[PDB]
Structure formats: C-alpha cells, structure tokens
Write a protein that binds this ligand. Sequence first.
Ligand SMILES: Cc1cc(C(c2ccc(Cl)cc2)c2ccc(Cl)cc2)sc1C(=O)N[C@@H](CCCN=C(N)N)C(=O)O
Length: 372
Amino acid sequence: EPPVILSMVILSLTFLLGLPGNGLVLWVAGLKMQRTVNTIWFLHLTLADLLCCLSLPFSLAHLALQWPYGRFLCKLIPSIIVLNMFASVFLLTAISLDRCLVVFKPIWCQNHRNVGMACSICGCIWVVAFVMCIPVFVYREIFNRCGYTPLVAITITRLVVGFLLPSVIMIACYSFIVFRMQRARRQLADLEDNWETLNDNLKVIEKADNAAQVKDALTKMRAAALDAQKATSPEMKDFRHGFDILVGQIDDALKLANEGKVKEAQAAAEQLKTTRNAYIQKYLERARSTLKSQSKTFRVAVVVVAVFLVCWTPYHIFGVLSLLTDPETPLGKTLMSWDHVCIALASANSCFNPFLYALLGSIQGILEAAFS
Ligand SMILES: Cc1cc(C(c2ccc(Cl)cc2)c2ccc(Cl)cc2)sc1C(=O)N[C@@H](CCCN=C(N)N)C(=O)O
C-alpha cells in the first residue's frame, strides 16, 4: 500500500522535471539549427516524450482518488502512453539502422539523403504507431474499475512487436558497428608505429658517425617506409606517390653512403623531412580527426538505447507474469500493487531521456554538439 504512495511521488517528480527540460530542448533545436536528416529524428523523439509527459496529470488524479467523471478519459489516457512507447521504439530503431547504414556503400549514402525522405519515414512511423495503438482504445471498458480472451493475445502481440524485434535489430546493428570500429584502430596503431620508428631512426642517423650505423639506420627506415606504404581515391594515389618519393630518397641516401661518404649521406637524410611534412602529415591529421567524431555519437546513441530498454523491461516482465499466473491467489494481491510502480517507471523514462543529452555533450553549444 505504501508502494502506491511511491508510485504517486514518482509520477509527480517526473511531471515536475519533464515539462521544462523537454520543452527547452524542443525550442532550442527547433528554432536555432538548420534542417538536416539527423536532428529531425531527435526532434521527433523529444516531441513524443513531451506528448507523453503532457498527459501525466490525469493519471495522478486517478491515482489519488482510487474516476467519477466520464468514461472517455478511462479509454483515452491509457492509449497515449502506449502510443509514446511505440513511437519511441520505432524512432530509436530507425536511428540505429541509419547510423549503421551510413558506413555502408555509397549507393545508399548518395541515393536519397534528403530531408523529405526523413519527414516521410517519420510520418510512416507515426502512422504505424497509431494503428498499433487503436486496439488499446477499442478493448477497454468500465465495469469504476478501469481494466480489460483477447487479453492472452494482446499482451503477446505487444511483447513481440514493441520489445523483441527492435531490440534484436539494434543489438545486431551496434555489434556490427563496434566490430567494424575495433578494426580501424589496429591499422591506425600500426601506421603510428611505422611513423614512430621512421622518426627516431631519422633522428639517430643525424648524430651517427661512421658509415655502418648510417647503413643500419637506413635499412630500418626503408623497411618501415615499405611497411607503412603497404598499409591502407586521389588522396590514396597521393599517399602512395609520397611514399614512393620517400623510398626513392632513401635509396639515394643508401647508395651515397655505400661508397664511403658520410656528410653527403647526412644531407640526403635531412632532405626527407620536407617531403615527409609536405605529404604525409595532412593524411595523419585527417586520420586522427576522422575518428573521435564517430565515438562522440556512437556512445550518445548507445546510452539512450540501453537506458530505454532498462526502463521498459519491468513493464513486460510483469505483463507476462500477470498473463501466466492465475488470479484469486495471494500472489496476485501484491502483483496488482507492484504493477503501479512498474508502470510508473515505464512512464518516468521520459524524464531520464533529456538529461543524457546535456550530460554526454551555452544551451545551444551543448545541445547542437550532442545532436551531431
Ligand atoms: C500505461 C498505463 C497506465 C495505467 C494506469 C496507471 C497510471 C499511473 C500509475 Cl502510477 C498506475 C496506474 C491508469 C489509470 C487510470 C488512467 Cl485514466 C490511466 C492510466 S494502465 C496502463 C497500460 O498501458 N496498461 C496496459 C496493460 C496493463 C497490464 N500491464 C502490465 N501489468 N504490465 C494496457 O491497458 O494495454
């Protein structure tokens, strides 16, 4: 019975902390940035969460007075929460799919990457959510007990569609993304190692006397340069041409040192710095910058997805347990009591969502950086 008071305080806290931040995010993202295929999805998700939190007061009013005013509210208010759940799940799986498909072939990257396509797909998402929602409105009546055979079927259908299939799709997509991301790292690591050995060999060769250490350092440099050139477009051709020039200069230095000349070998070795800086530095800088960008986004998506699933799982666990377990048992007496807190958490998810955007990213300077 105290759990009922826990439910009402949870609902009240969500209502008080959900309207301001969500409306703030909606306004900031709506009237500051410029329409792109990426931020429209987060705008739709925030709008759905705001619509969910806008119908909270009535649930609290019902829960405070055990509704002696109209049958319409008992049939409408439970529908909005389910519509919120369906729209949020579908938008999250669309976001995941798009993020995993960006790194695919350019066929889908250049095909129809336009804002109109995003608007149309969001329209289809909302339509499907509404069609899936209508059953809940239809199968609900006042006996003032507000509850529901079709019960055994509706719960299974909802569990299958809104929680099982999209979960598998997102898990597979993010597993593929992380497996592909862990691969690029090794290649960058190897290229950095080759650059490092080239660098310190070129450093030692300057201070090295006699023609034997010069040949040894040049041999190590040549091996490193060949290995780096093997690692892998106009920039690609440019990269390979730069390494070909570098290997040519290394050969010139080696042939000069073979004939027992030191100072000329030193000058030939010093000559490689200009070509190195003019050719490979820009590619190295791009390869560093062309990495963090992805992380600042993959983590932002993964945290949102995981938090959503964690907040919504008790709802379906308790739904299944109420479906299988028979009533008229002392278990049901507390099962009904705990159903309220489960639903309260499932509805409270909307307060958790808008804080992660600020935590993981001026109001604009943070929100716009998060929505990238
Ligand atoms: C979201 C929601 C909210 C509901 C309650 C309610 C709100 C706040 C709190 Cl703290 C406690 C109760 C409510 C009361 C009066 C009014 Cl006017 C509106 C809502 S019922 C309900 C819901 O969707 N039920 C599902 C399946 C039910 C069984 N599922 C289990 N067991 N997991 C459905 O009907 O299809």
